[PDB]
Nucleic acid binder design. Structure first.
Lengths: 243, 177, 202, 148, 45
RNA sequence: AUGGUGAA
RNA sequence: GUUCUUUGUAAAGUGCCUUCGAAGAGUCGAGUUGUUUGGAUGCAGCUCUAAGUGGGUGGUUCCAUCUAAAGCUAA
RNA sequence: GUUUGACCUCAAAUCAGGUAGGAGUACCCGCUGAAUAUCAAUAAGCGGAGGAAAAGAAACCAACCGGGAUUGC
C-alpha cells in the first residue's frame, strides 16, 4: 500500500481509491509573482487591474441530512470564531452566520435540551456549543481552512433552511415550545431588555441579591427544558446534565 | 537615426574599441556550443538591412566554423541541417581570429502564424524555398555561383552547367536549315 | 543616517509647533471672551461642520500614529502620558483645549461599545503589571464592587449611561508584511490622508 | 585597462542623485496599455479642447531622433547594454550637442519606470516643475561631468 | 444560493457551574488530575 | 576508373 | 444583375508655390596560393584593407552608362 | 536589508500549439568527381525542391541620330 507521504508527494491509503483522485489553488500561486512584478514596476494601476467549496461539499455530503455528521464540529468552530491572525472581516462573517442560524432556530424554536457549563452553554436541536461573551486568552492556518469549509457548508445549509434595522446598533412540538409560550419575560442587566435603555411582562429575571413581574431565575427555564424552586437569592438545584 | 552611427562605427573595423569588443565576444562564445540559439543579434544595423525584424517568428543563431564550400556557405548549411523546421534567409560576419571565424545567421519560421499572415514575409513559406542554402540561393550562395550581369559573368551568368548542356546539344528541326 | 531625515523632522516639528502655538493662543484668547482679534470666537467640530455644544459628550478615542515626520512636542508627550494614549475625562470646556493640541495625533452605539469592552478587557491586577483579561466577574466585585459594580456589565452600562463607573473605571481598565500585504496598505494610505482655527476633525 | 572610449561606464550617478532622478522621472510615466485603453474607451463612450500629454521618451531610435535636435534636456543611459556599440557614441553625441547625460546602472531598472521590461535609454523633452528639472540637471552635471 | 442537492437517497461530562459537591474533585486529588466541575454561586459568578 | 559484395 | 452597408473632420491622385532632401565595410579593392574557362574573367584558404558632388564598367584632356556589397515576382 | 523585489542567463515538463528525416528522381540547384593539352565541369557519389526549377527587373549592352527584366529559338 502507498504510504501517506508517498501518496501526497505523487498527487496508508488504498491505491485503488486514491490514484483516480489525483484530478485553482495551484494556479493562484501565479498571482503572488504577478504582484511582485507589479511592485517592481513601481506602478499600482496594473496591480489593481490584476486584483480586479461547492464541489467538495456535494461529494462529502451528497444529501442535506449527511451534513449533520460534521455539523457538530462546524458549529463548534463557527461559534468559537464568533467570540474570538484572523482578519476582522472573517470574525464578522462568522458572527453573522451564527446570528442568522440562531435567528432561524428561534423562528422555528427547534430546541430540546440545554446545559449551562464551564466550557459553555450547551444546546440541542443536533448538539452545538457556544462559549461565553468574554475574551479568549497554535497554527491558525488549519483553523482558518476549517472555518472556511464550515462556513461554506453552513451557507448552503442556511439557504436550504430558509427556502424550506436600528437593532443592529443596539445588539407545541416539544415542552420547550409548549411551555413558556406567551410568558413574556423581562430580563434585567444580568421579551424586553434593560440594556436597550442605555408592563405586560408576566415574569422578571434578575440575579442580584437586592431587588425591588414575578422574579424568576434562568435556572427555572433551564430545568424546565431539561418559580417552584428558583426564587431570587435562593440556592439553585444541582443542575444535572440532561444527557 | 542611430543605425547610421552604428554603420559608421562598424566601418572602422580595426578601431581599438571594436578590437576590444571582438576579442571579448570571441572569448565569450568560445565557452558555448558550436551552434546555439542567440537571444538577439550583436549587429542590429546589419540584420535590419538584411531583412531581419524583431517579431515572433525570427530566430538568430551563432555558429562557429574552422578557419581554412565557403565558410559562410558551411555555416548556412550547418544551421539549415540543425534548424530543419526553419528557413535560412541571410547571414553576416560577426567575428574572426587566428583559429575560428564566427558568423550570425537569421532564420524565419514559416510555421508561425505571424510569418504566414505577414504579406511581406509569407513568401518564404512556399515549398520552393525549402533549404535555400542547400541550393545556394542565399546571398553568399548566389555570389559563389557567379550570378551577375556583364561580361565578367558571361560563362556563369545563370547556370555554369546549363550553358555546357546548351552548347553540347544538337538542335534539329523538322525542316533542316 | 542621512541628513534628510533630521532636516525633515526639524521642519515638521517647527511647523506643527507653530500650529499648536496658534491653537493655544486662540484658546487662551477665547477663554477671555475678547472676540475682537480672533477669526472665530465660537467652537466647531467636524464629523461635515458641526457646532461644539457645551454638553460634555463622550466619544471613543482612536490613535492615528502621525504625522510621523512631526516629532511629538513636550506638551503632546505629557498629554498622551496622562491619557496613556502614547502607545499605538470627558469633552468638557477644560478638556477641549488639551484635546485639540493632540488632535492631529488622534481621531458610537451600544453594539460597538459592548463588544469593545467585552473583547479588550483590560484589568489591572496583582506580578503587579498583570492586565490579561476579564477573567471573572468576582474580580470586579472584589476590586470595584464597593462602588456598586457587581460585574463588568455594570461597567459597560455605566459607560454607556451618564454614571460614575465611566470615570471610576479609568483606574481599573493589512497589519502584516510581505508582497501580498503591500497593496492593501497602499490602498489604505489613500484613506489615511489642519488649520488652527478649523474645526476638530473626527 | 581598456580604451578610453570604453570604461566611461562604471562611473555613474551617485545613489542620492540617481534616486532623485528616478523620482522625478516617475512623475511622467507614460500611460500604460491598460490605462490608455480604458481612457480611450471612456472617451468613445462619452462621444457615443485637449492639452498636450506629457511623458518620458525612451525609444533608442526616437531618443536619438530627439537628440541632435537639441530638444532633449536630460538623457539617461543604461551601462549594461549587451551591444555596447549602441551606447558607446551616445555620451559623445550628447557632449557635442551640449545635452546633459547621466549613466544609470541597470537597463532593467531604467525600463521598470516606462512600463517596459528593459529600456536602453530615457530622455525628457517637455516638462510640467521646470525648476526641479533645472536643479536636477545642475546637480547631475556638477556630480558627473565635472568629476569624471 | 441554489439547491445543489434536492431530493437524494444518500456529550457533556457533568461539568455544571453548580454541580453536587461530590462531583467537584477534592483539592488533594486536583494534584493527581494534573476541565473539572466547580461550585459557583450563580450564573453571573 | 566509379560505386558495392564477402573474405582474418 | 440582385440585396444590406458605408463616414471618418478617412485614404489617395492631378497642376502650381514653398521648406527639406537617407542610399547594403572584413564590403570594393590589391597581394598570394588552389580551381574553371578556347574567355583572361570568375570561383576559393589567408596578410592588409577603401571613398561619398563617392564607387563600377569602356577610349582617345577626360567623355558614355549605372549605383553593387538585401530580397520577392506568373508568362 | 544577517532581507525583499526588477530583469538577463541557463536547465527541466510523458506541458499546449507546430515542423524536420525518408521515398521517388527524366528535368532543376549546390558540392565533389576519374578512366600538364584531349575524352571532362562527362561517368559514378552526396545533399536540396517543383510541376516545372534557376534567373529576373542592371554598379547592363554599346561608342551609336543609341537600346532598357529574366528566359527559349
Amino acid at each position: 500500500f502507498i504510504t501517506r507521504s508517498q501518496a501526497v508527494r505523487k498527487l496508508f491509503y488504498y491505491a485503488k481509491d486514491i490514484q483516480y483522485l489525483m484530478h485553482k489553488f495551484r494556479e493562484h500561486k501565479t498571482f503572488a509573482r504577478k504582484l511582485t512584478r507589479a511592485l517592481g514596476r513601481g506602478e499600482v494601476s496594473s496591480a489593481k487591474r490584476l486584483e480586479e467549496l461547492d464541489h467538495i461539499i456535494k461529494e462529502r455530503y451528497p444529501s442535506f441530512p449527511d451534513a449533520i455528521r460534521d455539523i457538530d464540529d462546524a458549529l463548534n468552530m463557527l461559534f468559537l470564531f464568533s467570540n474570538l491572525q484572523v482578519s476582522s472581516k472573517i470574525i464578522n462573517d462568522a458572527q453573522k452566520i451564527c446570528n442568522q442560524w440562531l435567528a432561524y432556530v428561534a423562528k422555528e424554536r427547534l430546541v430540546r435540551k440545554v446545559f449551562v457549563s464551564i466550557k459553555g452553554v450547551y444546546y440541542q436541536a443536533v448538539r452545538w456549543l457556544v462559549p461565553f461573551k468574554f475574551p479568549e486568552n497554535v497554527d491558525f492556518r488549519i483553523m482558518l481552512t476549517f472555518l472556511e469549509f464550515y462556513s461554506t457548508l453552513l451557507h448552503f445549509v442556511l439557504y436550504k433552511l430558509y427556502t424550506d434595522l436600528k437593532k443592529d446598533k443596539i445588539i407545541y412540538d416539544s415542552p420547550v415550545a409548549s411551555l413558556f409560550s406567551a410568558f413574556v419575560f423581562y430580563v434585567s442587566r444580568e421579551v424586553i431588555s434593560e440594556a436597550a435603555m442605555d408592563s405586560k411582562v408576566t415574569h422578571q429575571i434578575v440575579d442580584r441579591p437586592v431587588l425591588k413581574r414575578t422574579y424568576i431565575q434562568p435556572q427555572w427555564i433551564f430545568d424546565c427544558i431539561n418559580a417552584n424552586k428558583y426564587l431570587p437569592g435562593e440556592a439553585l438545584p444541582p443542575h444535572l446534565s440532561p444527557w | 537615426g542611430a543605425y547610421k552611427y552604428l554603420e559608421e562605427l562598424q566601418r572602422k573595423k580595426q578601431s581599438d574599441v571594436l578590437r576590444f569588443l571582438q576579442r571579448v565576444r570571441v572569448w565569450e562564445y568560445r565557452q558555448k556550443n558550436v551552434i546555439h540559439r542567440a537571444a538577439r543579434p550583436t549587429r542590429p544595423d546589419k540584420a535590419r538591412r538584411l531583412g531581419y525584424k524583431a517579431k515572433q517568428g525570427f530566430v538568430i543563431y551563432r555558429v562557429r566554423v574552422r578557419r581554412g564550400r565557403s565558410l559562410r556557405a558551411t555555416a548556412e548549411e550547418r544551421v539549415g541541417r540543425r534548424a530543419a523546421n526553419l528557413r535560412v534567409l541571410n547571414s553576416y560576419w560577426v567575428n574572426q581570429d587566428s583559429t575560428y571565424k564566427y558568423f550570425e545567421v537569421i532564420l524565419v519560421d514559416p510555421q508561425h502564424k505571424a510569418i504566414r499572415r505577414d504579406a511581406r514575409y509569407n513568401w518564404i513559406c512556399d515549398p520552393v524555398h525549402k533549404h535555400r542554402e542547400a541550393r545556394g540561393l542565399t546571398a553568399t550562395g548566389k555570389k559563389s555561383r557567379g550570378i551577375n550581369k556583364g561580361h565578367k559573368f558571361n560563362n556563369t551568368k545563370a547556370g555554369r552547367r546549363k550553358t555546357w548542356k546548351r552548347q553540347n546539344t544538337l538542335s534539329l528541326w523538322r525542316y533542316r536549315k | 543616517v542621512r541628513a534628510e531625515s533630521i532636516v525633515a523632522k526639524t521642519l515638521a516639528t517647527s511647523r506643527e509647533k507653530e500650529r499648536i502655538k496658534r491653537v493655544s493662543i486662540l484658546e487662551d484668547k477665547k477663554a477671555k471672551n475678547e472676540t475682537q482679534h480672533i477669526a472665530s470666537g465660537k467652537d466647531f467640530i467636524l464629523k461635515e461642520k458641526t457646532t461644539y455644544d457645551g454638553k460634555p459628550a463622550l466619544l471613543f478615542i482612536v490613535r492615528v500614529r502621525g504625522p510621523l515626520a512631526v516629532n511629538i512636542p513636550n506638551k503632546a508627550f505629557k498629554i498622551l502620558s496622562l491619557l496613556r494614549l502614547v502607545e499605538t475625562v470627558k469633552l468638557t470646556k477644560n478638556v477641549y483645549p488639551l484635546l485639540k493640541v493632540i488632535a492631529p495625533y488622534v481621531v458610537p452605539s451600544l453594539s460597538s461599545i459592548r463588544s469593545l469592552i467585552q473583547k479588550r478587557g483590560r484589568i489591572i491586577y496583582k506580578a503587579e503589571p498583570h492586565e490579561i483579561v476579564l477573567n471573572d466577574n468576582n474580580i470586579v466585585e472584589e476590586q470595584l464592587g464597593d462602588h456598586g459594580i457587581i460585574c463588568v456589565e455594570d461597567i459597560i452600562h455605566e459607560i454607556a449611561t451618564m454614571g460614575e463607573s465611566f470615570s471610576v473605571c479609568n483606574f481599573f481598565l493589512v497589519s502584516g508584511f510581505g508582497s501580498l500585504n503591500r497593496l492593501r496598505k497602499i490602498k489604505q494610505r489613500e484613506a489615511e490622508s489642519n488649520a488652527a482655527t478649523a474645526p476638530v476633525i473626527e | 585597462k581598456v580604451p578610453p572610449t570604453i570604461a566611461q561606464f562604471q562611473y555613474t550617478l551617485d545613489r542620492n542623485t540617481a534616486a532623485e532622478t528616478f523620482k522625478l522621472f516617475n512623475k511622467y510615466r507614460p500611460e500604460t496599455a491598460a490605462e490608455k485603453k480604458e481612457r480611450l474607451t471612456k472617451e468613445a463612450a462619452a462621444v457615443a479642447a485637449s492639452p498636450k500629454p506629457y511623458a518620458v521618451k525612451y525609444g533608442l531610435n526616437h531618443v536619438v531622433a530627439l537628440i541632435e535636435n537639441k530638444k532633449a534636456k536630460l538623457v539617461l543611459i543604461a551601462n549594461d547594454v549587451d551591444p555596447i556599440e549602441l551606447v558607446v557614441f551616445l555620451p559623445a553625441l550628447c557632449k557635442k550637442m551640449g545635452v546633459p547625460y547621466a549613466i544609470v546602472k541597470g537597463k532593467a531598472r531604467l525600463g521598470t519606470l516606462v512600463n517596459q521590461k528593459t529600456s536602453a535609454v530615457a530622455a525628457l523633452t517637455e516638462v510640467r516643475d521646470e525648476a526641479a528639472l533645472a536643479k536636477l540637471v545642475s546637480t547631475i552635471d556638477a556630480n558627473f561631468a565635472d568629476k569624471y | 444560493q441554489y439547491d445543489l442537492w434536492g431530493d437524494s437517497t444518500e456529550p457533556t461530562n457533568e461539568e455544571s457551574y453548580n454541580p453536587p459537591e461530590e462531583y467537584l474533585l477534592s483539592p488533594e486529588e486536583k494534584e493527581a488530575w494534573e476541565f473539572i466541575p466547580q461550585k459557583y454561586s450563580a450564573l453571573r459568578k
